[PDB]
Short mmCIF file of N, CA, C and O in Angstrom, two decimals:
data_model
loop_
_atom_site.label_atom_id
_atom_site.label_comp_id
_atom_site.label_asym_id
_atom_site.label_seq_id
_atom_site.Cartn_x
_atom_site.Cartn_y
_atom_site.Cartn_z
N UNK I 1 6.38 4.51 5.20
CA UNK I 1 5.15 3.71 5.21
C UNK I 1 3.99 4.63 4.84
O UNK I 1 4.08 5.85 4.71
N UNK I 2 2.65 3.75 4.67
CA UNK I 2 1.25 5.14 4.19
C UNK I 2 1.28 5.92 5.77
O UNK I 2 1.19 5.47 6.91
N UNK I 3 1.43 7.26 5.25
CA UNK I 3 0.95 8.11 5.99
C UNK I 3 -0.81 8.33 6.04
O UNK I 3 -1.68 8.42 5.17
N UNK I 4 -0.82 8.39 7.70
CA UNK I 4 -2.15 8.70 8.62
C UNK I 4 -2.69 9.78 7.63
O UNK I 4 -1.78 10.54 7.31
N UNK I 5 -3.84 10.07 7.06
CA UNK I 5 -4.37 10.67 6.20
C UNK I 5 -5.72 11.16 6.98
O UNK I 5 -6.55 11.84 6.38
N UNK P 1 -6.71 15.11 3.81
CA UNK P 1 -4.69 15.17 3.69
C UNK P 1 -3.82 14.84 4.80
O UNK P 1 -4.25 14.73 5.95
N UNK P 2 -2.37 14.64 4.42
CA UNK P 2 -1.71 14.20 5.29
C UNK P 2 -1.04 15.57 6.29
O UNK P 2 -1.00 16.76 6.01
N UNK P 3 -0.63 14.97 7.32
CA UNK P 3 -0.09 16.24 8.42
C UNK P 3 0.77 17.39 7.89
O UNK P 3 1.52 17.43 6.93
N UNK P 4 0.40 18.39 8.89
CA UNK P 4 0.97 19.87 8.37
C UNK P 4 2.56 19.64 8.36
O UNK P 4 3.32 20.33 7.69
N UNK P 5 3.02 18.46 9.27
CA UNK P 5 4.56 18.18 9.45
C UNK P 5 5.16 17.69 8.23
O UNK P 5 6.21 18.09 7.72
N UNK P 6 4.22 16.57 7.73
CA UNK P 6 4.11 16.18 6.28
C UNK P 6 4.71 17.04 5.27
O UNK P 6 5.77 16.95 4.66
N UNK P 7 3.65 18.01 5.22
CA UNK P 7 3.25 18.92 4.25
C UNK P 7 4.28 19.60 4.22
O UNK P 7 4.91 19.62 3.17
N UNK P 8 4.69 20.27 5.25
CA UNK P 8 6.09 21.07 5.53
C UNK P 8 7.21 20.46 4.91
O UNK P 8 8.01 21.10 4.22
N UNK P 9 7.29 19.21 5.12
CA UNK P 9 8.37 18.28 4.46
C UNK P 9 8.45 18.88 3.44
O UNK P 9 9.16 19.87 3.28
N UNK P 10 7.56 18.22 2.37
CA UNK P 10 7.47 17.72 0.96
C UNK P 10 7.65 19.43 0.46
O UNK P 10 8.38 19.67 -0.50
N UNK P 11 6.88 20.64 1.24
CA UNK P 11 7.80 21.88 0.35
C UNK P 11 9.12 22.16 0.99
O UNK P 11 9.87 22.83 0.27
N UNK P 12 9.49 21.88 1.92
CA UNK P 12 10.93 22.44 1.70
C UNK P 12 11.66 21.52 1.00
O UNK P 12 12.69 21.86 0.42
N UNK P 13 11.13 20.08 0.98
CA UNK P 13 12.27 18.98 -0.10
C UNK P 13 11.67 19.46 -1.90
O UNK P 13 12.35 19.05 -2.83
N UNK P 14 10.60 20.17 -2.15
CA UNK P 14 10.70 20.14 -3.36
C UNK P 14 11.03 21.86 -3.83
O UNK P 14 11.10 22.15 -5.03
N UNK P 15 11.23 22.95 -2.70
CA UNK P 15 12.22 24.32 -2.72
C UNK P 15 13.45 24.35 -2.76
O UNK P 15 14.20 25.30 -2.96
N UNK P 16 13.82 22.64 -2.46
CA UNK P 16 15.44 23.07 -2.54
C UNK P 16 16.09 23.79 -1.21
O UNK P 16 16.96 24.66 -1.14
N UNK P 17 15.49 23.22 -0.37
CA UNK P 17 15.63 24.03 1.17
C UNK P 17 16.64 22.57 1.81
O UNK P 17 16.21 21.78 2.65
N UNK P 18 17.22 22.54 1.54
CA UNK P 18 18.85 21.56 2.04
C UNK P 18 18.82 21.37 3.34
O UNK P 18 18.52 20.25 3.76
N UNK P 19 19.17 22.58 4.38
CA UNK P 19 19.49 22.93 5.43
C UNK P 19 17.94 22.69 6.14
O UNK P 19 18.12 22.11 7.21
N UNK P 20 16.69 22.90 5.94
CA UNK P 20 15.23 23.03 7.00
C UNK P 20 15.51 21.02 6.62
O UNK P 20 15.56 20.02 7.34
N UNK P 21 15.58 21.19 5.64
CA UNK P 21 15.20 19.53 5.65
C UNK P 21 15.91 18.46 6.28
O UNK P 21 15.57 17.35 6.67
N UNK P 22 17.25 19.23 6.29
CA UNK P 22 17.70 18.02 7.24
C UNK P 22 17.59 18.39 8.52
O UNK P 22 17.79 17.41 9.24
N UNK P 23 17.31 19.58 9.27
CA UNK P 23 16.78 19.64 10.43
C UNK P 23 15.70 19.64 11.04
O UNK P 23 15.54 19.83 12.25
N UNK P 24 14.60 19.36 9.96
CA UNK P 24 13.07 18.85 10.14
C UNK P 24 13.65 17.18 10.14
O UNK P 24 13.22 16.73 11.21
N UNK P 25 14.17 16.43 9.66
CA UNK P 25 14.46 15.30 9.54
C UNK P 25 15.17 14.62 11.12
O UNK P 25 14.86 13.59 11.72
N UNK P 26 16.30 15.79 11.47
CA UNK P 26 16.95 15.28 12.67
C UNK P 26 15.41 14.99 13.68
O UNK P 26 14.90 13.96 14.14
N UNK P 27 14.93 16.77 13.75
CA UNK P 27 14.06 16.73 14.86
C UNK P 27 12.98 15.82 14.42
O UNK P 27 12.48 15.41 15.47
N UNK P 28 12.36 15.30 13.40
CA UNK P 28 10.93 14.54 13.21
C UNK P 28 11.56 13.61 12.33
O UNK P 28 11.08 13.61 11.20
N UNK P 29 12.73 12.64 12.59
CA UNK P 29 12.84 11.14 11.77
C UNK P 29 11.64 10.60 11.36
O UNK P 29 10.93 11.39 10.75
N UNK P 30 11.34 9.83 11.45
CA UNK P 30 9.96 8.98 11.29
C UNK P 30 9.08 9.72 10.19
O UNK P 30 8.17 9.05 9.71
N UNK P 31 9.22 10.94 9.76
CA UNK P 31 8.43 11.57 8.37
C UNK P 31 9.29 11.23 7.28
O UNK P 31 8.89 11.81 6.27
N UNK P 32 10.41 10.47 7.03
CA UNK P 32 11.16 10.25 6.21
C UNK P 32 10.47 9.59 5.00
O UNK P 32 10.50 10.11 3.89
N UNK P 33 10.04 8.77 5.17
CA UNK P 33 9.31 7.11 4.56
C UNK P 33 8.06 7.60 4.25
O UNK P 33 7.82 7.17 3.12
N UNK P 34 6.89 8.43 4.71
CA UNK P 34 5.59 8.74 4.84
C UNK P 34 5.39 8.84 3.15
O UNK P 34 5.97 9.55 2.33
N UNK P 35 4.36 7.86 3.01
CA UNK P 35 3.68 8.42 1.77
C UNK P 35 2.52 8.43 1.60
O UNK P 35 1.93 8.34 2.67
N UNK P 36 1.52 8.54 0.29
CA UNK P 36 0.44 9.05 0.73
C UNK P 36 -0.20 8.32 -0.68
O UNK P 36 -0.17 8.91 -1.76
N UNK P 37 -0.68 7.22 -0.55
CA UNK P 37 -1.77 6.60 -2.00
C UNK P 37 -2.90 7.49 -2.14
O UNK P 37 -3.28 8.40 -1.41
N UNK P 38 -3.24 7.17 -2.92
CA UNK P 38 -3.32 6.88 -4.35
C UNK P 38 -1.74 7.96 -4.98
O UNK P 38 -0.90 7.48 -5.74
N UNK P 39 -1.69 8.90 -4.63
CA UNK P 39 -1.47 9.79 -5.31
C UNK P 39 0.57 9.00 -5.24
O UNK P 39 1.39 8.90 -6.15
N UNK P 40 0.65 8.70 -4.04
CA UNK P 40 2.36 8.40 -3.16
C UNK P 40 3.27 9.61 -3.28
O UNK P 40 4.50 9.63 -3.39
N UNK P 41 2.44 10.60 -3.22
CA UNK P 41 3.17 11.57 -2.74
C UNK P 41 4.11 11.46 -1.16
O UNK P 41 3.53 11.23 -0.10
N UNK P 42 5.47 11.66 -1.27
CA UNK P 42 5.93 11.57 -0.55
C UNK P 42 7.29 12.54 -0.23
O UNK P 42 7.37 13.44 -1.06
N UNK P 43 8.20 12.57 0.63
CA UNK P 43 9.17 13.13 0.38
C UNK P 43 10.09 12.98 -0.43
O UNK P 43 10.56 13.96 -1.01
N UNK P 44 10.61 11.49 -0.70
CA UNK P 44 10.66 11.05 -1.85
C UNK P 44 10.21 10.71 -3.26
O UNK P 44 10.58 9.92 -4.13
N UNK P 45 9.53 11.38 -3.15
CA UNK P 45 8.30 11.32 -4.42
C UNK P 45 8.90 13.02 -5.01
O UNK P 45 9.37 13.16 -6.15
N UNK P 46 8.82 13.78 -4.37
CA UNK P 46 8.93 15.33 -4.47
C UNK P 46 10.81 15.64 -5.01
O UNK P 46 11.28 16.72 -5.36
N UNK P 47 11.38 14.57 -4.92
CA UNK P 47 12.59 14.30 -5.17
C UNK P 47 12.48 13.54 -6.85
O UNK P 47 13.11 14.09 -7.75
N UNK P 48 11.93 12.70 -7.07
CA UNK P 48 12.52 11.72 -7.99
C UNK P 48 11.37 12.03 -9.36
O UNK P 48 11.38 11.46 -10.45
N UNK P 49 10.27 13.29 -8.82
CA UNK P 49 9.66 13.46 -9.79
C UNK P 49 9.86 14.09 -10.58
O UNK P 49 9.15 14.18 -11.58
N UNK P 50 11.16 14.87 -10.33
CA UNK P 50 11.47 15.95 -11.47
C UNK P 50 12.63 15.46 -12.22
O UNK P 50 13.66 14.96 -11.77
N UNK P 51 12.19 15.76 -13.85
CA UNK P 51 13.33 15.35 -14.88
C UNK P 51 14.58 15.20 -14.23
O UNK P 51 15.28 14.23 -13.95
N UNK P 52 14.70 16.80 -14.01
CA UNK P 52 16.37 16.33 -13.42
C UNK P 52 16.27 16.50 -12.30
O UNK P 52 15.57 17.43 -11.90
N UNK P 53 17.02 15.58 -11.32
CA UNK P 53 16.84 15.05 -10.48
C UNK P 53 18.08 15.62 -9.15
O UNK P 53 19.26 15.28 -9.24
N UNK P 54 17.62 16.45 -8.06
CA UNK P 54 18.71 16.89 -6.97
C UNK P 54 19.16 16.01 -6.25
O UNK P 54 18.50 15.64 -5.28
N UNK P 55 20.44 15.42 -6.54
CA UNK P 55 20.79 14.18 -5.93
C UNK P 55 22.12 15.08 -5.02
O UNK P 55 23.24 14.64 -4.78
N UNK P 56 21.59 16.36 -4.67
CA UNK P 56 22.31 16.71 -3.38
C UNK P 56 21.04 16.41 -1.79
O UNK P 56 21.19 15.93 -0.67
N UNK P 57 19.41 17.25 -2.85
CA UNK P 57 18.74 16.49 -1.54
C UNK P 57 18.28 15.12 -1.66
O UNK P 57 17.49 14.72 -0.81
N UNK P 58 18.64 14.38 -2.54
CA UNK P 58 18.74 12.70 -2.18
C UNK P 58 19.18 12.16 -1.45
O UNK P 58 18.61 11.33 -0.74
N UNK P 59 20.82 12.61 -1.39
CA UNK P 59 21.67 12.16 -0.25
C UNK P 59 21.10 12.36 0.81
O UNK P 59 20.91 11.52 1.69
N UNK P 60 20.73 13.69 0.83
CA UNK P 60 20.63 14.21 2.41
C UNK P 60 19.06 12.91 2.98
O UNK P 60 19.08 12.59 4.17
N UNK P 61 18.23 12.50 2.35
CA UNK P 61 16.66 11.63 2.44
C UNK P 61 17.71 10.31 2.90
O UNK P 61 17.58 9.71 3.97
N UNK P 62 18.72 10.01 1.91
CA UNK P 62 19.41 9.09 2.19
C UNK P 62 20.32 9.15 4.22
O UNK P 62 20.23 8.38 5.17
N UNK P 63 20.75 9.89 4.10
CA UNK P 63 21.68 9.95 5.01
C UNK P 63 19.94 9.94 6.41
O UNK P 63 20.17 9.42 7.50
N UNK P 64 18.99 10.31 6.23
CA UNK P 64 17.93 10.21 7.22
C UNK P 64 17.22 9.15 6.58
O UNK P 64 16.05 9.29 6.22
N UNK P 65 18.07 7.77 6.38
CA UNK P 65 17.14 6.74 6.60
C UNK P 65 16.23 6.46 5.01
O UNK P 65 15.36 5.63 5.27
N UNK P 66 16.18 6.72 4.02
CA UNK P 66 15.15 7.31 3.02
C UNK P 66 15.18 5.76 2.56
O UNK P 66 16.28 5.29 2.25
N UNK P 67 14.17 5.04 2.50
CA UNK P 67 14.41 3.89 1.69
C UNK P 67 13.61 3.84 0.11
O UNK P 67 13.37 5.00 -0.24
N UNK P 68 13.18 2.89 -0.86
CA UNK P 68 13.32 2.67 -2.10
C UNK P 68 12.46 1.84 -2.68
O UNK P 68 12.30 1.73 -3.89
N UNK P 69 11.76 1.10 -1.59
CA UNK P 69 11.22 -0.19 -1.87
C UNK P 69 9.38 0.19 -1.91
O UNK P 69 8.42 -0.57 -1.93
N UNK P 70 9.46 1.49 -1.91
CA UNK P 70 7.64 1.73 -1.64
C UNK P 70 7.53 2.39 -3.27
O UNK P 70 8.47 2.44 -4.06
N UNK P 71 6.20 2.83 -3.52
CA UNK P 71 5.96 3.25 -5.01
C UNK P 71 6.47 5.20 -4.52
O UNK P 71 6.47 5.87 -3.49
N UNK P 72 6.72 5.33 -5.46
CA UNK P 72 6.86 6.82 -5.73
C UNK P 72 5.91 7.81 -6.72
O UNK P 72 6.21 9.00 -6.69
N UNK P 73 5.21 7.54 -7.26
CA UNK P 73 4.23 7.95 -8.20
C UNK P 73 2.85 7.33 -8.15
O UNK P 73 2.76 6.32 -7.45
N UNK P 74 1.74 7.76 -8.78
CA UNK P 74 0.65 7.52 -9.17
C UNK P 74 0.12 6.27 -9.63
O UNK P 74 -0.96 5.72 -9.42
N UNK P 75 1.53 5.81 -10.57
CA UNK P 75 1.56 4.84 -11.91
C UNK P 75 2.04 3.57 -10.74
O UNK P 75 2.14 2.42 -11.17
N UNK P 76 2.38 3.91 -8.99
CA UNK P 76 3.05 2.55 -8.63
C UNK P 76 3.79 1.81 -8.94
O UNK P 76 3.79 0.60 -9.14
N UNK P 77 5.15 3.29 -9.04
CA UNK P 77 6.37 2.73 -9.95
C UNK P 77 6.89 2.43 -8.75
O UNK P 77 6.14 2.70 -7.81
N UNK P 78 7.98 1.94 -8.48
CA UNK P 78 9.28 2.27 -7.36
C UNK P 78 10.07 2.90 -8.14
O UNK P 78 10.07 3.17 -9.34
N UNK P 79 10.82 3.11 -7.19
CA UNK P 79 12.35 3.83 -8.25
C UNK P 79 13.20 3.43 -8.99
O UNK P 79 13.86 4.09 -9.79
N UNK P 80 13.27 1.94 -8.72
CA UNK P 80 14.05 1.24 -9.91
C UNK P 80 12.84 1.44 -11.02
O UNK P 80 13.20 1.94 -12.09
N UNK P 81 11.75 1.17 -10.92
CA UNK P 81 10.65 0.84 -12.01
C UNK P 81 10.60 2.33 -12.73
O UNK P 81 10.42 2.56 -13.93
N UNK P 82 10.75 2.99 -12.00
CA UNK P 82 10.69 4.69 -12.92
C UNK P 82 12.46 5.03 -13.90
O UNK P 82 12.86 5.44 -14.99
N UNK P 83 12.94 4.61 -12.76
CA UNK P 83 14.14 4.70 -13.68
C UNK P 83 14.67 3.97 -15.15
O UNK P 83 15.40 4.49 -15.99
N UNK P 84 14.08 2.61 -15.17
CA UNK P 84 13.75 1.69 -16.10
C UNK P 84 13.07 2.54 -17.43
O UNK P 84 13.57 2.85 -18.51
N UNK P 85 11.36 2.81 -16.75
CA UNK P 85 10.65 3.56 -17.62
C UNK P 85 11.57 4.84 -18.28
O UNK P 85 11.44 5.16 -19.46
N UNK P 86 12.40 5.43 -17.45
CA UNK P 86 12.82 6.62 -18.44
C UNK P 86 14.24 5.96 -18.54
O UNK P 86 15.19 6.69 -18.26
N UNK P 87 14.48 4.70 -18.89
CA UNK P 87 16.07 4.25 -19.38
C UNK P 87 17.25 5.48 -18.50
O UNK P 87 18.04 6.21 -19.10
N UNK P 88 17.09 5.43 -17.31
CA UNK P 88 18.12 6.88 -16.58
C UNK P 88 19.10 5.97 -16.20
O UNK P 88 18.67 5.28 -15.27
N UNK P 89 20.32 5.66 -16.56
CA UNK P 89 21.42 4.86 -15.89
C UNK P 89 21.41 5.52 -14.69
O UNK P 89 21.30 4.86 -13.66
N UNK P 90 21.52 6.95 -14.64
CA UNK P 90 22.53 7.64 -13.44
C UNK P 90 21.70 7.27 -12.39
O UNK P 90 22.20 6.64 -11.46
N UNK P 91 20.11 7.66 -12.39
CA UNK P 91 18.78 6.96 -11.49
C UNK P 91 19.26 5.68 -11.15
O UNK P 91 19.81 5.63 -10.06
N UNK P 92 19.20 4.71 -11.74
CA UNK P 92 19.52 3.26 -11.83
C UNK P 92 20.84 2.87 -10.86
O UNK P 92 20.72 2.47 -9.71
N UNK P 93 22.04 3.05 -11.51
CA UNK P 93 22.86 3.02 -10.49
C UNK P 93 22.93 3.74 -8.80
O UNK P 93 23.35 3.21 -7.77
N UNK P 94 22.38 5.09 -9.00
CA UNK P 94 21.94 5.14 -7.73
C UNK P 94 21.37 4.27 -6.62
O UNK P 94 21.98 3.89 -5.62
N UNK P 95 20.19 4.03 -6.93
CA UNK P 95 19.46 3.28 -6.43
C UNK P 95 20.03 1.84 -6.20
O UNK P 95 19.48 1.18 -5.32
N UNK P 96 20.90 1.38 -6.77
CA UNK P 96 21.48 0.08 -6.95
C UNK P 96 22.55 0.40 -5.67
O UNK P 96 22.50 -0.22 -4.61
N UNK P 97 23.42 1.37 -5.94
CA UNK P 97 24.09 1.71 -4.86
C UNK P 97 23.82 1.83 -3.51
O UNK P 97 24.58 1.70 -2.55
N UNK P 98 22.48 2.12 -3.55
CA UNK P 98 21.22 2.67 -2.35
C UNK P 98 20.64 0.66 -2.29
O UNK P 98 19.44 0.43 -2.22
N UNK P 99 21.33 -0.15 -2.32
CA UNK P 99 20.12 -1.49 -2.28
C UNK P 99 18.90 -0.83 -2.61
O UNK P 99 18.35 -0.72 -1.51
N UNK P 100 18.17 -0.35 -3.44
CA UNK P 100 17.21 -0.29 -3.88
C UNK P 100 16.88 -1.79 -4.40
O UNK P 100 17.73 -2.36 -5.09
N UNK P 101 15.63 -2.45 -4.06
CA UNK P 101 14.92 -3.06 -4.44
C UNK P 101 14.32 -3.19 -6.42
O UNK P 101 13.73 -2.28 -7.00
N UNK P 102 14.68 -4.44 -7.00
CA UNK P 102 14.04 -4.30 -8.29
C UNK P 102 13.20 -5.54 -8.35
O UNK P 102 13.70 -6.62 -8.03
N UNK P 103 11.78 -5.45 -8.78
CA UNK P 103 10.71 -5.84 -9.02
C UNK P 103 11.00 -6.98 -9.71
O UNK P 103 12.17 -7.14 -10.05
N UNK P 104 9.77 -8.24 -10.15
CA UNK P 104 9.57 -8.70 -11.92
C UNK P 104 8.58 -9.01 -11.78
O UNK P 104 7.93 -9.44 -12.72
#
């Protein structure tokens, strides 16, 4: 999934 | 940027480090999938971006869960969609083998 950036 | 755990990933999966990766993988599952827009750098991304392609550490992304269905590149290909773009059967059937997901 999007990784926490 | 994304986490140093991240980060750690994506160079030992694009050094060719076999052995850290699947034991960064046992101990931290859940970094498997992580990707990162715009760019989708991912662990899988660091895998499928190079011409030729290490489908010894594929397996291993595979065997920790690695799924198929997110973009892998810039362009917001998936992996069937990149494999398409460069006509790669061997890509293609992989992924087919892998239920990889194909688009229209």
């Amino acid at each position: 999934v999007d990784a926490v950036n | 940027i994304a986490s140093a755990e991240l980060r750690e990933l994506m160079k030992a999966v694009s050094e060719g480090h076999y052995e850290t990766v699947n034991t960064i993988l046992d101990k931290d599952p859940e970094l498997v999938n992580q990707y990162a827009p715009p760019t989708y750098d991912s662990p899988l991304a660091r895998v499928l971006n190079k011409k030729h392609i290490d489908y010894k550490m594929l397996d291993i992304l595979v065997k920790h869960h690695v799924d198929f269905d997110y973009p892998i590149n810039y362009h917001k290909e998936t992996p069937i969609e990149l494999a398409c773009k460069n006509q790669d059967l061997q890509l293609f059937k992989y992924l087919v083998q892998h239920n990889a997901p194909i688009s229209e």
